[PDB]
Every structure is written in structure tokens, then in C-alpha cells.
């Protein structure tokens, strides 16, 4: 019944619509959570480097479930990562060679022959982007591909890649003109579970805070599950408890309830 972990999604949850949060209030709150030995976790679809930019003073202290569970960090150190074999990366790239970025542990990668305009645009989206001559030559392992193409081609390319890369990777739509290739069995919720196992804690000790469809599993999992006021009704139905919306510090108010030991933590 004791709160030992607070986990939050970012977009639509810990962040307002302006993609910011009350940093001074959260700092003071975190100082207090640390005194009580309560872990704070950010769990999101977002890139690890996009998550930690929000926490420059806490990034080696709090924990991250990034890239929907393909990357897990605890005390500033990588605890878990997904990866493809040299074999599977070869297979994937073969199929793509019929513009893309490959995501590795140390860098993102693009072909040196890829259109220069595309390479310049990608450079803005990744913390590090390395032009490479050969994908079988790079010393990294890969967990994700991002593909850019005319959006009209997307439904057919998804169908093609779904069968062709079955059991290796799953194609999903991302933004306008983009497809992600993701490792199929890696999810936000099982990324969180990896942290719980490391800490010898149970989902019964967990506060989870979310708003969006991809928060459903994490919310089902946690004993103290909270849907943001802006959450769709289906998410509000899954979560046991409610809080104010993301433009009114709703996630911080949950943390406040834990600190106050008020309901449902009383």
C-alpha cells in the first residue's frame, strides 16, 4: 500500500500543451520524494535525448523508460536496451533498399549517399547523426528504424514490411510521411517492470500517471493509477483515480497527494 515509485508519461501528462512544466515546484517535490526514498520515473515513446533535456539537473538521478521500452536508464546508466542481430539488421536494410535513419545505442545513422536535404533535416531530430558508407561496417547495435516517404505509399509499404519483416520488426505509422520499424515485444509497461525487478518492488507500490492510448498498459498495471483530466474516457475508465488536466499541473498534484499522504494514499 506504500508508494515506492511514481511513473509519469510526458506528452499530455507531465507536460502542458506548451511542452513545459513547473520546474521549481517539481524540484522541491522531488527533493521531498528523495527524502522518503520514492523513485521517480519518466516513461514515454520519446527518444532518450528528448526526455533528458527536460531534466538537466535530475537526469542521473531519476529513471527513464524511453523509446516505448527499447531503452531503460536508472541512475544515469543504461539498464536495458533492445537490439537486432547483425543478421536482422542486414535483412531489414535489404527490404528498405527497394530514405531512412537507423537508431543505435551510440548514435543514429544514415547512408552517406542519402539525399543531402534529408540528411540535413534528420540532423535536427537526433542528438547525433553519423553518415556511414556501409551499415554492416558500423560498430553499434540497432533498435529502431525511421523511414521517410510520400504518405500515399505508406499503406502499401506497411503491408509489405509487415509480412517481410515478421518476427524481426513491426512497421507502425508515425508522422506525416514517416514509418517507424520497432522491435515488437518491447513496451512502456515491461520497461517499467525491468526497473521494479531491479529495485525488488511490486506494481502494488506504484503510482502511474497517464493520458493517452499508449498509457493503457502502465495504468492497468499500477495499483495507484491516475488519468489526467484531459484523458479520453477510455483511459479514465482504466485508471482508478483522476487528477486535473495537463495545463493545470495535474501530474504534480498527484505527486502532491503522495507527499501529503491524502486520499487514496491515506
UniProtKB/Swiss-Prot annotation:
Mg(2+) binds at residues 9, 11, 211-212. One of its GO terms (cellular component) is cytosol. The active site is at residue 9. Phosphate binds at residues 10, 44-45, 188, 214. Magnesium. Can also use other divalent metal cations as manganese, cobalt or zinc. Its EC number is 3.1.3.23. Its cofactor is Mg(2+); Mn(2+); Co(2+); Zn(2+). GO terms for molecular function: fructose-1-phosphatase activity; magnesium ion binding; phosphatase activity; sorbitol-6-phosphatase activity; sugar-phosphatase activity. It holds the Pfam family Hydrolase_3. Signal peptide: none annotated. InterPro entries: Cof, HAD-like_sf, HAD-SF_hydro_IIB, HAD_sf. The keyword Nuclease does not apply. Induction: Regulated by the cAMP receptor protein crp. It catalyses: sugar phosphate + H2O = sugar + phosphate. Keywords: Hydrolase, Magnesium, Metal-binding. Belongs to the HAD-like hydrolase superfamily. Cof family. SupH subfamily. Homodimer. PANTHER family: 5-AMINO-6-(5-PHOSPHO-D-RIBITYLAMINO)URACIL PHOSPHATASE YBJI-RELATED, PHOSPHOSERINE PHOSPHATASE. Catalyzes the hydrolysis of sugar phosphate to sugar and inorganic phosphate. Has a wide substrate specificity catalyzing the hydrolysis of ribose-5-phosphate, glucose-6-phosphate, fructose-1-phosphate, acetyl-phosphate, glycerol-1-phosphate, glycerol-2-phosphate, 2-deoxy-glucose-6-phosphate, mannose-6-phosphate and fructose-6-phosphate. Appears to have a low level of phosphotransferase activity using monophosphates as the phosphate donor. This is Sugar phosphatase YbiV. It comes from Escherichia coli (strain K12). The gene is ybiV.
Amino acid at each position: 500500500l506504500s508508494v515506492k515509485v511514481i511513473v509519469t508519461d510526458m506528452d499530455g501528462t507531465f507536460l502542458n500543451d506548451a511542452k513545459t512544466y513547473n520546474q521549481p515546484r517539481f524540484m522541491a517535490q522531488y527533493q521531498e520524494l528523495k527524502k522518503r526514498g520514492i523513485k521517480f520515473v519518466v516513461a514515454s515513446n520519446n527518444q532518450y535525448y528528448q526526455l533528458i533535456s527536460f531534466f538537466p539537473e535530475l537526469k542521473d538521478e531519476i529513471s527513464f523508460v524511453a523509446e516505448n521500452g527499447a531503452l531503460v536508464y536508472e541512475h544515469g546508466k543504461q539498464l536495458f536496451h533492445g537490439e537486432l542481430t547483425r543478421h536482422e539488421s542486414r535483412i531489414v536494410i535489404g527490404e528498405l533498399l527497394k530514405n531512412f535513419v537507423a537508431c543505435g545505442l551510440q548514435s543514429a545513422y544514415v547512408s552517406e549517399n542519402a539525399p543531402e536535404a534529408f540528411v540535413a533535416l534528420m540532423a535536427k531530430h537526433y542528438h547525433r547523426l553519423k553518415p556511414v558508407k556501409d551499415y554492416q561496417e558500423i560498430d553499434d547495435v540497432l533498435f529502431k528504424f525511421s523511414l521517410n516517404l510520400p504518405d500515399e505509399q505508406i499503406p502499401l509499404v506497411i503491408d509489405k514490411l509487415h509480412v517481410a519483416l515478421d518476427g524481426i520488426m513491426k512497421p507502425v505509422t508515425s508522422g506525416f510521411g514517416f514509418i517507424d520499424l520497432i522491435i515488437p515485444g518491447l513496451h512502456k509497461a515491461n520497461g517499467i517492470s525491468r526497473l521494479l525487478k531491479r529495485w525488488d518492488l511490486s506494481p502494488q507500490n506504484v503510482v502511474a500517471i497517464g493520458d493517452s492510448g499508449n498509457d493503457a498498459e502502465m495504468l492497468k498495471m499500477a495499483r495507484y493509477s491516475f488519468a489526467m483530466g484531459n484523458a479520453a474516457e477510455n483511459i479514465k475508465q482504466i485508471a482508478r483515480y483522476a487528477t486535473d488536466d495537463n495545463n493545470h499541473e495535474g501530474a504534480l498534484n498527484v505527486i502532491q497527494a503522495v507527499l501529503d499522504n491524502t486520499s487514496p494514499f491515506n
